[PDB]
Swiss-Prot record:
Keywords: Glycosyltransferase, Transferase. This is SPbeta prophage-derived glycosyltransferase SunS. Transfers a hexose moiety onto 'Cys-41' of bacteriocin sublancin-168 (SunA). Accepts UDP-glucose (UDP-Glc), UDP-N-acetylglucosamine (UDP-GlcNAc), UDP-galactose (UDP-Gal), UDP-xylose (UDP-Xyl) and GDP-mannose as substrate. It comes from the Bacteria. Belongs to the glycosyltransferase 2 family. The gene is sunS. GO terms for biological process: bacteriocin biosynthetic process; protein S-linked glycosylation via cysteine.
Length: 333
């Protein structure tokens, strides 16, 4: 696909196929074989491709303070919006009924499984594609019209993937493994009680297309200082995930992270050490760098320089471009 793009850029770069493909960020990374044939019939053929429909799904519990700004941010850009309420005790449903009558409201007991609630929306959705957003997110106005173009180009090339907008924390931390959107063609389901993500039902990990969409995330802003509250909820769920895979370094990391967020640094260090130990021979090393960086932060703060040296050396070996290595090195000499 990077080849096809290089020629679409060269050979006349004002085709609607050119623009729309440029919404995709990590094109260089997509390695499945697309039979390059002739950019001419490809350009022309795109013009007649169908513009897929997209459902926007929101799972909600007690979001009175936020749901209106959230829905105002998505009200223009989706064929269908489904809100799945877990029997809120605040006035969440009534705000939606009043100000967003075209939103479909469905109800479902919370079962302490974020993947169950999301998959419930997938069952209810009638569009060709789904995109999930949370009540403490804002969909950027600059996204106007783009999410359907993304889905159009992906259907065109029959790319099986999930789709990640950039999500910006209040901190300015920018995430690109967010996996919020995918085609509703019976291939992808959410898996996990917490920290859930959409998996092929053989439980393999879909390719992740990063796209030039932006979503703001207010949910850990000190405006609402919900930090410790959301954290205690998630750690009870992370603990269940860990029981089922007590050697999984990803779950060990998330548990350590949440112990740390709950001012339990002692207790975090042991889980992070075991996570880092188990990551060496693990296939999905996505959070290996975050485990190392967090552990080095904790050891540094506790003046445990001897152990900090051990993990900083591992950090720099595995991730020589890590932007945090120089900081730790400067703090101990
Ligand atoms: O019992 C609940 C709790 C939460 N939500 C909704 O789930 C969403 C995400 O919950 P949130 O308050 O934002 O916790 P966060 O810590 O900000 O992250 C979230 O952590 C969750 C669990 O992994 C989410 O699914 C992820 O999208 C992640 O961004 C919200 O729209 C909530 O209203 C429910 O529907 N029912
Ligand atoms: Mg949130």
């Amino acid at each position: 696909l990077s080849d096809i793009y290089l020629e679409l850029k060269k050979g006349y770069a004002d085709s609607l196929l050119y623009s729309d493909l440029s919404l995709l960020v990590n094109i260089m990374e997509y390695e499945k074989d697309i039979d390059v044939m002739s950019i001419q019939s490809l350009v022309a053929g795109y013009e007649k491709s169908d513009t897929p429909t997209i459902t926007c799904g929101i799972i909600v519990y007690n979001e009175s303070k936020r749901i209106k700004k959230c829905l105002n941010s998505v009200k223009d850009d989706f064929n269908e919006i489904i809100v799945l309420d877990s029997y809120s005790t605040d006035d969440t449903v009534d705000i939606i009924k009043c100000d967003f009558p075209d939103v479909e409201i469905k109800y479902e007991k919370w079962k302490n499984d974020f993947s169950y609630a999301r998959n419930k929306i997938i069952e209810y959705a009638t569009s060709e594609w789904i995109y999930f957003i949370d009540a403490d997110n804002l969909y950027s106005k600059e996204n106007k019209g783009k999410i359907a173009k993304v889905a159009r180009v992906l259907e065109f090339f029959s790319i099986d993937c999930v789709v990640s907008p950039y999500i910006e924390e209040y901190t300015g931390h920018l995430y690109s493994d967010t996996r919020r959107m995918f085609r509703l063609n019976g291939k992808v389901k959410f898996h996990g009680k917490v920290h859930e993500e959409p998996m092929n039902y053989n439980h393999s990990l879909p390719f992740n297309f990063i796209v030039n969409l932006k979503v703001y995330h207010n949910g850990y802003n000190p405006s609402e200082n919900n930090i410790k509250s959301k954290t205690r909820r998630n750690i009870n769920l992370t603990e269940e995930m860990l029981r089922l895979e007590p050697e999984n370094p990803k779950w060990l990391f998330f548990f350590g992270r949440e112990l740390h967020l709950l001012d339990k640094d002692e207790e975090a260090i042991d889980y992070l050490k075991k996570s880092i130990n188990n990551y060496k021979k693990f296939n999905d090393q996505r959070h290996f760098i975050d485990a190392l960086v967090l552990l080095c932060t904790l050891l540094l703060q506790r003046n445990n320089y001897v152990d900090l040296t051990l993990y900083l050396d591992i950090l720099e070996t595995e991730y020589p471009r890590c932007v945090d290595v120089d900081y730790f090195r400067s703090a101990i000499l």
